[PDB]
Amino acid sequence: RLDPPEAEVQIDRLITGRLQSLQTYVTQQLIRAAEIRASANLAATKMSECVLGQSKRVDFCGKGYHLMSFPQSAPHGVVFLHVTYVPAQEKNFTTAP
């Protein structure tokens, strides 16, 4: 619809718009990748400290006293089945140091 001498202006406008869109998309992807990498590092730490061994850290490998964990693969993620021991029935008693 336009002679190239003036169509170059419209082409430049479109190029600028699409380039800005690409840059925004890539920046969003970079930030999201940083977040997902933090989550993946946390998941690897949880695997190492709960599946490969018993963890003394509180509330790390599930609520209550940690016994073990089992990993399960999920799409684009992992699932841990934290097994925990939880005291149930408490009785008062009179104590002395």
């Binding site: 949880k46 599930g62 841990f80 934290h82 097994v83």
Partner: peptide, 10 residues
């Protein structure tokens, strides 16, 4: 004995 789930993106 309590078996609780925990989901983490990887």
């Amino acid at each position: 004995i309590s078996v609780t789930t925990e989901i983490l993106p990887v």
